[PDB]
Design an enzyme around this catalytic site. Structure first.
Site, PDB file in Angstrom:
ATOM      1  N   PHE A 199     -12.121  -5.975  14.468  1.00  0.00           N
ATOM      2  CA  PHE A 199     -11.007  -6.843  13.137  1.00  0.00           C
ATOM      3  C   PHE A 199     -10.512  -5.926  11.966  1.00  0.00           C
ATOM      4  N   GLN A 200      -9.211  -5.919  12.139  1.00  0.00           N
ATOM      5  CA  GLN A 200      -8.977  -4.841  10.971  1.00  0.00           C
ATOM      6  C   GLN A 200      -9.325  -3.511  11.268  1.00  0.00           C
TER       7      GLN A 200
ATOM      8  N   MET B 262      24.303   9.185   2.916  1.00  0.00           N
ATOM      9  CA  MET B 262      24.777  10.322   2.739  1.00  0.00           C
ATOM     10  C   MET B 262      24.438  10.212   4.770  1.00  0.00           C
TER      11      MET B 262
ATOM     12  N   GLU C  93       0.983  -1.512   0.287  1.00  0.00           N
ATOM     13  CA  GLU C  93       0.038   0.289  -0.539  1.00  0.00           C
ATOM     14  C   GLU C  93       0.710   1.218   0.266  1.00  0.00           C
TER      15      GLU C  93
ATOM     16  N   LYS D 231     -17.478  -0.288   5.685  1.00  0.00           N
ATOM     17  CA  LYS D 231     -18.211  -0.870   4.960  1.00  0.00           C
ATOM     18  C   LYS D 231     -19.836  -1.835   4.604  1.00  0.00           C
TER      19      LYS D 231
HETATM   20  C1  LIG Z   1      -7.621 -13.303   8.187  1.00  0.00           C
HETATM   21  C2  LIG Z   1      -8.363 -13.440   9.585  1.00  0.00           C
HETATM   22  C3  LIG Z   1      -8.881 -14.851  10.233  1.00  0.00           C
HETATM   23  C4  LIG Z   1      -9.482 -14.492  11.330  1.00  0.00           C
HETATM   24  N1  LIG Z   1      -9.799 -16.214  12.435  1.00  0.00           N
HETATM   25  C5  LIG Z   1      -9.663 -16.155  13.188  1.00  0.00           C
HETATM   26  C6  LIG Z   1     -10.747 -17.245  13.988  1.00  0.00           C
HETATM   27  O1  LIG Z   1     -11.766 -17.586  12.911  1.00  0.00           O
HETATM   28  N2  LIG Z   1     -10.860 -17.400  14.801  1.00  0.00           N
HETATM   29  C7  LIG Z   1      -9.818 -16.581  16.235  1.00  0.00           C
HETATM   30  O2  LIG Z   1      -9.860 -17.321  17.104  1.00  0.00           O
HETATM   31  N3  LIG Z   1      -9.305 -16.015  16.504  1.00  0.00           N
HETATM   32  C8  LIG Z   1      -9.794 -15.140  14.027  1.00  0.00           C
HETATM   33  N4  LIG Z   1      -7.536 -14.333  13.806  1.00  0.00           N
HETATM   34  C9  LIG Z   1      -7.918 -13.479  14.524  1.00  0.00           C
HETATM   35  C10 LIG Z   1      -9.357 -12.307  15.478  1.00  0.00           C
HETATM   36  O3  LIG Z   1      -9.221 -11.465  14.683  1.00  0.00           O
HETATM   37  C11 LIG Z   1      -8.386 -11.879  16.695  1.00  0.00           C
HETATM   38  O4  LIG Z   1      -6.838 -11.754  16.807  1.00  0.00           O
HETATM   39  C12 LIG Z   1      -7.984 -13.477  17.756  1.00  0.00           C
HETATM   40  O5  LIG Z   1      -9.703 -13.288  18.763  1.00  0.00           O
HETATM   41  C13 LIG Z   1      -7.121 -12.897  19.015  1.00  0.00           C
HETATM   42  O6  LIG Z   1      -6.987 -14.358  19.604  1.00  0.00           O
HETATM   43  P1  LIG Z   1      -7.224 -14.003  20.942  1.00  0.00           P
HETATM   44  O7  LIG Z   1      -8.527 -12.883  21.573  1.00  0.00           O
HETATM   45  O8  LIG Z   1      -7.803 -14.612  21.753  1.00  0.00           O
HETATM   46  O9  LIG Z   1      -6.040 -12.479  22.175  1.00  0.00           O
HETATM   47  P2  LIG Z   1      -6.332 -11.349  22.618  1.00  0.00           P
HETATM   48  O10 LIG Z   1      -6.808 -10.208  21.285  1.00  0.00           O
HETATM   49  O11 LIG Z   1      -4.173 -10.892  22.252  1.00  0.00           O
HETATM   50  O12 LIG Z   1      -6.665 -11.337  23.535  1.00  0.00           O
HETATM   51  C14 LIG Z   1      -6.781 -11.428  24.812  1.00  0.00           C
HETATM   52  C15 LIG Z   1      -7.192 -10.831  26.141  1.00  0.00           C
HETATM   53  O13 LIG Z   1      -6.594 -11.488  27.099  1.00  0.00           O
HETATM   54  C16 LIG Z   1      -6.591 -10.536  28.049  1.00  0.00           C
HETATM   55  N5  LIG Z   1      -5.267 -10.845  28.532  1.00  0.00           N
HETATM   56  C17 LIG Z   1      -3.329 -10.240  27.400  1.00  0.00           C
HETATM   57  N6  LIG Z   1      -2.857 -11.166  28.809  1.00  0.00           N
HETATM   58  C18 LIG Z   1      -3.304 -11.371  30.479  1.00  0.00           C
HETATM   59  C19 LIG Z   1      -3.070 -11.986  31.216  1.00  0.00           C
HETATM   60  N7  LIG Z   1      -1.272 -12.144  31.327  1.00  0.00           N
HETATM   61  N8  LIG Z   1      -3.982 -12.715  32.335  1.00  0.00           N
HETATM   62  C20 LIG Z   1      -4.979 -12.116  32.015  1.00  0.00           C
HETATM   63  N9  LIG Z   1      -5.915 -11.534  30.821  1.00  0.00           N
HETATM   64  C21 LIG Z   1      -4.741 -11.467  29.662  1.00  0.00           C
HETATM   65  C22 LIG Z   1      -6.117  -8.776  27.515  1.00  0.00           C
HETATM   66  O14 LIG Z   1      -6.828  -8.062  28.029  1.00  0.00           O
HETATM   67  C23 LIG Z   1      -7.149  -9.385  26.269  1.00  0.00           C
HETATM   68  O15 LIG Z   1      -8.043  -9.081  26.460  1.00  0.00           O
HETATM   69  C24 LIG Z   1      -8.392 -14.215  11.844  1.00  0.00           C
HETATM   70  C25 LIG Z   1      -7.768 -13.782  12.420  1.00  0.00           C
HETATM   71  C26 LIG Z   1      -7.059 -12.996  10.261  1.00  0.00           C
HETATM   72  C27 LIG Z   1      -6.382 -12.156  10.326  1.00  0.00           C
HETATM   73  C1  LIG Z   2      18.665  15.234   2.256  1.00  0.00           C
HETATM   74  C2  LIG Z   2      17.742  16.311   1.588  1.00  0.00           C
HETATM   75  C3  LIG Z   2      18.638  17.497   1.688  1.00  0.00           C
HETATM   76  C4  LIG Z   2      17.676  18.295   1.554  1.00  0.00           C
HETATM   77  N1  LIG Z   2      18.904  19.518   1.042  1.00  0.00           N
HETATM   78  C5  LIG Z   2      18.426  20.453   0.409  1.00  0.00           C
HETATM   79  C6  LIG Z   2      19.046  21.776  -0.576  1.00  0.00           C
HETATM   80  O1  LIG Z   2      19.843  22.135  -0.140  1.00  0.00           O
HETATM   81  N2  LIG Z   2      18.224  22.427  -1.515  1.00  0.00           N
HETATM   82  C7  LIG Z   2      16.991  22.965  -0.631  1.00  0.00           C
HETATM   83  O2  LIG Z   2      16.390  23.876  -1.385  1.00  0.00           O
HETATM   84  N3  LIG Z   2      16.352  21.792  -0.804  1.00  0.00           N
HETATM   85  C8  LIG Z   2      16.364  20.871   0.264  1.00  0.00           C
HETATM   86  N4  LIG Z   2      16.102  19.769  -0.015  1.00  0.00           N
HETATM   87  C9  LIG Z   2      14.382  19.529   0.092  1.00  0.00           C
HETATM   88  C10 LIG Z   2      14.151  20.542   1.552  1.00  0.00           C
HETATM   89  O3  LIG Z   2      14.065  20.028   2.634  1.00  0.00           O
HETATM   90  C11 LIG Z   2      12.923  21.137   1.327  1.00  0.00           C
HETATM   91  O4  LIG Z   2      11.718  20.147   0.941  1.00  0.00           O
HETATM   92  C12 LIG Z   2      12.597  22.244  -0.154  1.00  0.00           C
HETATM   93  O5  LIG Z   2      12.769  23.277   0.492  1.00  0.00           O
HETATM   94  C13 LIG Z   2      10.871  22.212  -0.674  1.00  0.00           C
HETATM   95  O6  LIG Z   2      11.595  23.356  -1.542  1.00  0.00           O
HETATM   96  P1  LIG Z   2      10.000  24.237  -1.013  1.00  0.00           P
HETATM   97  O7  LIG Z   2       9.928  24.818   0.528  1.00  0.00           O
HETATM   98  O8  LIG Z   2      10.528  25.871  -2.161  1.00  0.00           O
HETATM   99  O9  LIG Z   2       8.815  23.856  -2.291  1.00  0.00           O
HETATM  100  P2  LIG Z   2       7.854  23.532  -0.470  1.00  0.00           P
HETATM  101  O10 LIG Z   2       8.683  22.741   0.249  1.00  0.00           O
HETATM  102  O11 LIG Z   2       6.423  22.518  -1.431  1.00  0.00           O
HETATM  103  O12 LIG Z   2       6.769  24.991  -0.210  1.00  0.00           O
HETATM  104  C14 LIG Z   2       6.215  25.371  -0.998  1.00  0.00           C
HETATM  105  C15 LIG Z   2       5.671  27.339  -0.653  1.00  0.00           C
HETATM  106  O13 LIG Z   2       4.199  27.451  -1.191  1.00  0.00           O
HETATM  107  C16 LIG Z   2       4.166  27.827  -0.844  1.00  0.00           C
HETATM  108  N5  LIG Z   2       3.039  27.428  -1.828  1.00  0.00           N
HETATM  109  C17 LIG Z   2       2.351  26.787  -2.917  1.00  0.00           C
HETATM  110  N6  LIG Z   2       1.321  26.855  -3.868  1.00  0.00           N
HETATM  111  C18 LIG Z   2       1.508  27.770  -4.139  1.00  0.00           C
HETATM  112  C19 LIG Z   2       1.007  28.520  -5.241  1.00  0.00           C
HETATM  113  N7  LIG Z   2      -0.004  27.659  -6.060  1.00  0.00           N
HETATM  114  N8  LIG Z   2       1.040  30.238  -4.987  1.00  0.00           N
HETATM  115  C20 LIG Z   2       1.624  30.583  -3.985  1.00  0.00           C
HETATM  116  N9  LIG Z   2       2.356  30.101  -3.053  1.00  0.00           N
HETATM  117  C21 LIG Z   2       2.279  28.369  -3.149  1.00  0.00           C
HETATM  118  C22 LIG Z   2       3.299  26.531   0.294  1.00  0.00           C
HETATM  119  O14 LIG Z   2       2.158  27.863   0.957  1.00  0.00           O
HETATM  120  C23 LIG Z   2       4.783  27.072   0.820  1.00  0.00           C
HETATM  121  O15 LIG Z   2       4.435  27.851   1.686  1.00  0.00           O
HETATM  122  C24 LIG Z   2      16.166  18.790   0.700  1.00  0.00           C
HETATM  123  C25 LIG Z   2      16.242  17.285   0.662  1.00  0.00           C
HETATM  124  C26 LIG Z   2      16.114  15.935   1.321  1.00  0.00           C
HETATM  125  C27 LIG Z   2      15.666  14.722   1.302  1.00  0.00           C
END
Ligand SMILES: Cc1cc2nc3c(=O)[nH]c(=O)nc-3n(C[C@H](O)[C@H](O)[C@H](O)COP(=O)(O)OP(=O)(O)OC[C@H]3O[C@@H](n4cnc5c(N)ncnc54)[C@H](O)[C@@H]3O)c2cc1C
Ligand SMILES: Cc1cc2nc3c(=O)[nH]c(=O)nc-3n(C[C@H](O)[C@H](O)[C@H](O)COP(=O)(O)OP(=O)(O)OC[C@H]3O[C@@H](n4cnc5c(N)ncnc54)[C@H](O)[C@@H]3O)c2cc1C
Ligand SMILES: Nc1ncnc2c1ncn2[C@@H]1O[C@H](COP(=O)(O)OP(=O)(O)OP(=O)(O)O)[C@@H](O)[C@H]1O
Ligand SMILES: Nc1ncnc2c1ncn2[C@@H]1O[C@H](COP(=O)(O)OP(=O)(O)OP(=O)(O)O)[C@@H](O)[C@H]1O
Ligand SMILES: COC(=O)c1ccccc1CS(=O)(=O)NC(=O)Nc1nc(OC)cc(OC)n1
Ligand SMILES: COC(=O)c1ccccc1CS(=O)(=O)NC(=O)Nc1nc(OC)cc(OC)n1
Ligand SMILES: Cc1ncc(C[n+]2csc(CCOP(=O)(O)OP(=O)(O)O)c2C)c(N)n1
Ligand SMILES: Cc1ncc(C[n+]2csc(CCOP(=O)(O)OP(=O)(O)O)c2C)c(N)n1
Ligand SMILES: [Mg+2]
Ligand SMILES: [Mg+2]
Ligand SMILES: [Mg+2]
Lengths: 255, 607, 245, 604, 49
Positions: free
Chosen positions: B121-122, B502, B59, B171
């Site tokens: 979840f998620q 760098m 992503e 969703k």
């Molecule tokens: C694609 C996918 C599918 C999934 N499907 C399933 C599924 O079908 N079945 C399933 O079970 N899971 C599934 N999961 C996972 C699910 O989303 C949860 O993460 C899962 O239920 C977590 O297990 P848990 O709640 O038992 O543990 P946890 O989420 O870690 O919860 C632990 C609980 O116990 C408490 N606790 C922690 N430590 C202690 C301690 N020392 N003493 C007392 N209490 C404590 C915590 O406060 C917490 O409330 C899936 C995950 C994915 C990614």
């Molecule tokens: C390793 C590294 C080294 C770097 N060293 C340098 C360096 O030596 N020299 C250098 O220049 N940069 C350097 N940078 C980048 C630096 O950190 C800034 O990102 C850079 O100064 C950004 O350029 P800028 O401020 O002109 O543009 P921006 O950061 O995008 O600023 C734009 C400004 O103009 C305004 N503005 C935007 N759109 C409009 C518009 N349509 N009309 C009017 N105003 C507008 C905005 O409000 C904003 O204040 C470096 C980056 C890295 C990763």
């Protein structure tokens, strides 16, 4: 380690018997006062000599008048007098007919057995130094009449050697006690709907306007602080109309 | 609702909508890998006549291939992978396209919406994972929103500075059938701001253009600092030529700016930066006015930011010079260096809107005196071949440059990351736009081959050469077979120095030749290419270099060419550490001999 | 587009017209001035007294604005607050005239001292407005003008019962706000009126009664004036730094 | 209490010393311009061995194979930018399967962070969703503390991945101050007096569990990977299974924990699990879950998962007991009746005393053996003149590897080959089956095989991989030569993406959409990488090749051309319960073989 | 801002913090002359009626 300790108060609770025993014991007494006082309201034409003519009549007939106050309405040549009497209905009604017959009066109304708003005004200066100082201050002015010295020394020395007397307290603690007393009086007059109109280093003046039975209670609660000076009015009144709901007045069961 | 309602998708499944949306967005090619959670989509695009399909073995290839397609065609690169492991494998291309500004629309599958956050979840938090390395992402909650989100994705990925966007597709969403009319026209919040402040902004940028032209005409030692921004428009390079010819302004380019300017031109300063030529570096440092066009002042370009452009900076304090920045995004204005004049928007558009304000110049004798002096005093020097010696890497690039040019073909060059990347940028003559495709922003190894494949898809009859390194090639060499299946006659050149060049250069210079795990075990690339189904050619001796290079280019179909180059050769010039651009480390024939004997002493003769 | 909003366009003063307004409005005296004097009598509560002091002051033609007999919380001791007006030597004659009476302990002059003068007032005050008040006064004054009053716009007649209800409470609020500002209170609320209460200076009592006057005062009763001197205290830094000696 | 034994050392040199302190003997990594200070310090380090892959993803997958086979954490030392983003997939994979891993990624200097620097990626912000805990070391003073925290977290509770970002200026910096190295974990600081009340709770949970087990009449041990995270795990599981005569079914990651040559073995559960285990679960009155988390691949339709268990629970005579280390996964999928928090192995020992010994479960095993002898892993076996069957390859190799007398470790990719390697392979030993189940990453087989081979240099590490999966990361084929790992790569080449094509043949009318990649010459490829290439496409050639394959003294690749379009059975998909599986039938396969040829025009 | 504020004074609060600090630091009976010093203070609740 142990939790920070707290002395538990554990406030005791009533039981059914001691509670009832308390309520029954704290019962007052019915009809401790005789027939309720009567209030009359005179509508008098404001001409020179009316106050001497009315009050002079009651004194010439030995009517036990508790209070008499003349109030000036917002009408030209018209005054209102509120009188409070004591005695039977037959004696007081006669007093009404005796005053109403006078020339400069329009009509004398009877406000007894009627819904009225009784009001009275009081202004009192209250000491902030406390109880001990008030005993010292009051006894000091009494020696200006008692003409005694060597015998009164037993009292004044006893007073000034009390714990919370200002003489035995630091200047900082007397200051706090002044404002503590002030806050107590202020909270006390606020509950009665009064005001504190004057504050000084040694005293304060409170102002309250309410019915006589309210003010007397107020002056009794403020009394322990020490009333240095008091001015309490007579009693004026204004008739009230007792409102009743349309459902209550619909009860015309005069069958 | 009051907007428009579409009924063209009523009755179609989410996958079948996706098929239509590709034709509605004008998609020629989709790079992807099938999976469980994305099955409803793949079922709908089965033998689809709306676009071709390229199937990688990984992503990461799909992503990098899509990038090469976008850098060459100018069209958004579409990636269609599954959930979980399929979506976590496209993170590096996304992160790469996010830094180099490459338009991508990544479509990842996803577990049903009723399983989200159940450790299914998620299942992966793809939106969360890709959140920082994408311009924008979204998870489609319902079929009704699906065409709306797709249009939002493609618009964002192409608006302003181009970039990658991710659309998570559950969703049950892609499998369900649409039953109601839906809105489709996009209403981005950014567009609501531009609509409210349209008149105000459009006048503001014009005012800046006026002030820019005044400062340009005032300049006496100007330098055009050109980046990748000028390449994001068709009329980009030509307006750069026009501006450079009208006012006689020398043009230097970044790594991603290469191709935007004819390097046969006397005003060409070539590449500047860390491994840029001294002529361009010194020009930038001594210029009174820097006109940054489509660049972002990368730390690989400016070197020491404190020491960057002393003369241009003091000229701004005197009102006679400074820095002018043509950017599309205000994010990159006044971020690294202070700018006196900022011109917002598309650089090409603004340049074509400033031509009527630039005073024509015919001669800059004083300024071009130092430039042509530097060109003769500081060239791209290196230890050239001697009778009875190993093949030199820089020489191979120079020879391939004229060989590929003497074919009459349209040549597209992709590279990996390392010493070979810089040498391919230094000793190759760039004239045509969109002909140099490299990973500069993120610098991803294993970028060379897949980008070459994707670029080949965009330009079938073009000569696509991948100048890769041995270590870089050993990252995604699995895509060799993918090139055969995709029918891409890519040209693979591996400058094999049997080392991580760098990294060894930095170890030789800064770590007393202590080479730690920088020498990987390379496989037989010739036997590898033939095992994958390609043609393999190896050059050991110096004499066979010319004869094999001609065969390498003349060969019809995919071919791999390995050239055993000399080892432990540092890329020069070099601006590193606290060194300014004017403090570069140039080539010295005696020093290299000294470092050679010292290396043998410390490594015990092993290196 | 334009969201319409009427411009009030408030005018501003200049240095001249601003002065012209201040000169025009500032208060002024009148012919034959008059000032207030306050006396405080400490009397013994024997039979009579009230008729004695009032009679003595009336038999000599004094002004006398109020008397007000106040009860101290002390056995057989009353207190009176007499309000007078006239020349300082004239009211001094009145003071010595009352003090000579045998039940009078002393008569103190509070006219040249910081005191607290309070007066109680209880008014009924209609809620039905001016139009109804003109009707009510003319009704008890015992034609054509009667018809014109009842043909006015804001009389209770020819006016919806709902607007009368609101105008009742609108007046009730306006009266309440006045009483609040003056430090008073509404003690009673009926369907047509509202009894208010206020204890303040007579100069402030009359001010309140003048402001609430347009609402129509049904009944009224002013106590008089009660006076109690503030406990002597005004300045902190000038207590010993007077250097007047 | 301040450490001062690192004063004067650089961050990279401190890193080198921390590895020996963490008993690390192997590091999988790839150099870069930001991780240079670390690589310069570990140069010729005699404290641990180094394995150099060709891709960072390889390093991550190698670290997992190392971790699951040894029980030790897998250490990854990659650079920033692309070097870090290339380890995301194995991190997400380890985060799903619960695999102890400590990934050290490089980083741009702290002075350049937040300036869109060169090779700068928000690795902390990206890996946050797929790691137990990550951190960016701010200063060299914090470096020994962070590393200590990383290893502890990665191995505490349920194991998993942790990421430690190392800035350029940090690893180059020289330590000049005393430092704290003592970890101060918050969840660990909760244990002040709560440890007592909790220790009583788990013990009373054991009591209720032991009572319900003795009351059960048709119990089933549902075992996962949690029983493997302890040395006495498989040992105590057998002790209980013998004591109470309880049959044992395991998950994909639970395989190896129980002897499948034991009469009480039920084999695998779930989607592609045998009918015997699925029916046992669906008809059990009590389910004892030990170290499993009820995955959707296992429970099938959650609505129909174990009706007899739920019905028994409502009648107070059974249900579901769950032994889980982290309360997070308790009552997450299915409502358990009794929860036993903590290590499953540890608690099984405390419960073992309270279990009433059962002589025999007659009618229960009679029904189990009935299913077991009625629903085998049936598949269309080879015929005279036919193509090599994938299931048969697993069969033969399972015996050939067993006849070696060597300790065999098996790693797989993802797909049909993964399931067939789990069904037809007989598991007896713990930590011998290392597969990607949780995330199911393709290209996992080869690097995990290399990693496991590093962990167990004596063992016979066999990679049962698929053609499509192998193409993902076949670049590490050269890494095996340089690492000196004599791994055995088995490719079941059906020239397709079987797991996807199966779902397309069953649910999408045999419409194969881009599920056929162009495989290289695996034998020419293997020898180009430096291995020996073996190929078999004839039945009478297989057994001799499988022996030459295994007996090859060094790295070797064997491509077995297998039959195409063969579905993994049984299969519980859609809304079907575990009892509603789809079993194998010779006529059904023979018909769809004819149906496919018509729909594909004879192409497939 | 919302904060729960004690009404038992500084002494009790100084006591309250020490109790919860020795419950996480060490299980040993350390800081004996601190709990004994904070307590038996004049305005600590345990010494008042
Ligand atoms: C694609 C996918 C599918 C999934 N499907 C399933 C599924 O079908 N079945 C399933 O079970 N899971 C599934 N999961 C996972 C699910 O989303 C949860 O993460 C899962 O239920 C977590 O297990 P848990 O709640 O038992 O543990 P946890 O989420 O870690 O919860 C632990 C609980 O116990 C408490 N606790 C922690 N430590 C202690 C301690 N020392 N003493 C007392 N209490 C404590 C915590 O406060 C917490 O409330 C899936 C995950 C994915 C990614
Ligand atoms: C390793 C590294 C080294 C770097 N060293 C340098 C360096 O030596 N020299 C250098 O220049 N940069 C350097 N940078 C980048 C630096 O950190 C800034 O990102 C850079 O100064 C950004 O350029 P800028 O401020 O002109 O543009 P921006 O950061 O995008 O600023 C734009 C400004 O103009 C305004 N503005 C935007 N759109 C409009 C518009 N349509 N009309 C009017 N105003 C507008 C905005 O409000 C904003 O204040 C470096 C980056 C890295 C990763
Ligand atoms: N010792 C004091 N000196 C001055 N003012 C005080 C003193 N004590 C209280 N006050 C303030 O005076 C206020 C009372 O004055 P008030 O509100 O009644 O106005 P007033 O009746 O017009 O008084 P005056 O006629 O003296 O101006 C108190 O509410 C208090 O705020
Ligand atoms: N029309 C009314 N009838 C009865 N109570 C009213 C009416 N209007 C107002 N009130 C309530 O009566 C309150 C008056 O309280 P007040 O202090 O005067 O009680 P009071 O002095 O004991 O007189 P009373 O004995 O008549 O209740 C008003 O604040 C108001 O809350
Ligand atoms: C990938 O599955 C899911 O996204 C998923 C995850 C959690 C819950 C449900 C699903 C959908 S599914 O159960 O119906 N499986 C599916 O769509 N495809 C499918 N394809 C396989 O082969 C490539 C293998 C396989 O699991 C073993 N699942
Ligand atoms: C990788 O550099 C950084 O992380 C970085 C990023 C931004 C700013 C500064 C740095 C540190 S650096 O400029 O000094 N570069 C470095 O340490 N190593 C280094 N190694 C190279 O070869 C492998 C190539 C190379 O860039 C071309 N940089
Ligand atoms: C995935 C990845 N890992 C690490 C790096 C850091 N890195 C940059 S160049 C290089 C060595 C590659 O050298 P090579 O590809 O052989 O080209 P050369 O310099 O030798 O000509 C490395 C490891 C990177 N850019 N990408
Ligand atoms: C990186 C990745 N992409 C996609 C998938 C989805 N997927 C699962 S199995 C499979 C096909 C692989 O089939 P293969 O590896 O050849 O094993 P087979 O079933 O064919 O025996 C795919 C694409 C995955 N698990 N991982
Ligand atoms: Mg190289
Ligand atoms: Mg005032
Ligand atoms: Mg396959």
């Amino acid at each position: 380690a142990t939790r920070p300790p707290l002395p538990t108060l554990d406030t005791p609770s009533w039981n059914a018997n001691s509670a009832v025993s308390s309520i029954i014991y704290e019962t007052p007494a019915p009809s401790r006062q005789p027939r309720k006082q009567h209030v009359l309201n005179c509508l008098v034409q404001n001409e020179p000599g009316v106050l001497s003519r009315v009050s002079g009549t009651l004194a010439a007939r030995g009517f036990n008048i508790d209070s008499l106050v003349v109030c000036n309405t917002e009408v030209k040549d018209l005054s209102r007098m509120t009188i409070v009497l004591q005695g039977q209905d037959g004696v007081i009604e006669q007093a009404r007919r005796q005053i109403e017959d006078l020339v400069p009066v329009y009509a004398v109304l009877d406000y007894t057995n009627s819904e009225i708003i009784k009001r009275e005004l009081v202004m009192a200066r209250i000491s902030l130094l406390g109880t001990e100082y008030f005993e010292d201050l009051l006894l000091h002015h009494h020696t200006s009449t008692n003409a005694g010295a060597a015998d009164s020394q037993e009292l004044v020395a006893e007073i000034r050697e009390k714990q919370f007397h200002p003489a035995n307290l630091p200047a900082s603690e007397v200051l706090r006690l002044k404002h503590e007393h002030l806050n107590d009086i202020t909270n006390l007059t606020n509950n009665f709907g009064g005001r504190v109109v004057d504050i000084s280093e040694t005293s304060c003046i409170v102002e309250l306007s309410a019915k006589p039975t309210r003010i007397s209670a107020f002056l009794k609660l403020v009394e322990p602080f020490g009333v240095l000076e008091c001015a309490r009015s007579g009693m004026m009144a204004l008739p009230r109309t007792p409102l009743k709901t349309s459902t209550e007045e619909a009860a015309d069961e005069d069958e | 609702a009051e907007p428009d309602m579409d009924t063209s998708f009523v009755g179609l499944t989410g996958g079948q909508i996706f098929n239509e949306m590709m034709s509605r967005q004008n998609v020629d090619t989709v790079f992807g890998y099938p999976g469980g959670a994305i099955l409803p989509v793949y079922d709908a695009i089965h033998n689809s006549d709306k676009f071709n399909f390229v199937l990688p073995k990984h992503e990461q290839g799909a992503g990098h291939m899509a990038e090469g397609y976008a850098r060459a065609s100018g069209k958004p690169g579409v990636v269609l992978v599954t959930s979980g492991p399929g979506a976590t494998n496209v993170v590096t291309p996304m992160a790469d396209a996010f830094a180099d500004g490459i338009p991508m629309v990544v479509f990842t599958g996803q577990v049903p919406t009723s399983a989200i956050g159940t450790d299914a979840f998620q299942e992966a938090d793809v939106v969360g994972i890709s959140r920082s390395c994408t311009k924008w992402n979204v998870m489609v909650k319902s079929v009704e929103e699906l065409p709306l989100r797709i249009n939002e994705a493609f618009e964002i990925a192409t608006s302003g500075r181009p970039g990658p966007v991710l659309v998570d597709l559950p969703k049950d969403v892609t499998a369900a059938i649409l039953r109601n009319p839906i809105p489709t026209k996009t209403t981005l919040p950014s567009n609501a701001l531009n609509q409210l402040t349209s008149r105000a902004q459009d006048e503001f940028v014009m005012q800046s253009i006026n002030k820019a032209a005044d400062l340009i005409n005032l300049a006496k030692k100007p330098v055009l600092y050109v980046g990748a921004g000028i390449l994001n428009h068709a009329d980009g390079p030509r307006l750069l030529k026009e501006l450079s010819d009208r006012a006689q302004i020398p043009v230097t380019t970044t790594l991603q700016g290469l191709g935007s300017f004819d390097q046969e031109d006397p005003k060409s300063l070539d590449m500047l930066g860390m491994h840029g030529c001294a002529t361009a570096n010194l020009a930038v440092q001594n210029a009174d006015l820097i006109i940054a066009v489509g660049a972002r002042f990368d730390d690989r370009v400016t070197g020491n930011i404190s020491k960057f452009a002393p003369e241009a900076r003091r000229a701004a304090a005197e009102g006679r010079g400074g820095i002018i920045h043509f950017e599309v995004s205000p994010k990159n204005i006044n971020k690294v260096v202070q700018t006196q004049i900022a011109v917002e928007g598309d650089a090409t558009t603004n340049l074509g809107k400033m031509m009527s304000k630039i005073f024509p110049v015919k001669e800059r004798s004083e300024w071009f005196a130092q430039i042509n002096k530097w060109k003769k005093e500081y060239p791209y020097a290196y230890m050239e071949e001697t009778p009875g010696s190993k093949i030199k890497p820089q020489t191979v690039i120079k020879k391939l440059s004229k060989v590929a040019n003497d074919t009459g073909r349209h040549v597209i060059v992709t590279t990996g990351v390392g010493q070979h990347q810089m040498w391919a940028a230094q000793h190759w003559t760039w004239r045509n736009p969109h002909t140099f495709i490299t990973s500069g922003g993120l610098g991803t190894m294993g970028y060379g081959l897949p980008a070459a494949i994707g670029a080949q898809v965009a330009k079938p009859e073009s000569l696509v050469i991948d100048i890769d390194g041995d270590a870089s090639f050993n990252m995604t060499l699995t895509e060799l077979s993918s090139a055969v299946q995709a029918g891409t006659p890519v040209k693979i050149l591996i400058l094999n120095n049997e080392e991580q060049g760098m990294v060894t250069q930095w170890q030789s210079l800064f770590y007393e030749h202590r080479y730690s795990h920088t020498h990987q075990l390379n496989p037989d690339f010739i036997k590898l290419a033939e095992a994958m189904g390609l043609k393999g050619l190896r050059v050991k001796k110096q004499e066979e270099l010319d004869a094999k290079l001609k065969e390498f280019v003349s060969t019809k179909g995919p071919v791999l060419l390995e050239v055993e180059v000399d080892k432990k050769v540092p890329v020069l010039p070099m601006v590193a550490g606290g060194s300014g651009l004017d403090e570069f480390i140039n080539f010295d024939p005696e020093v290299e001999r000294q470092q050679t004997e010292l290396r043998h002493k410390r490594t015990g003769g092993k290196h």
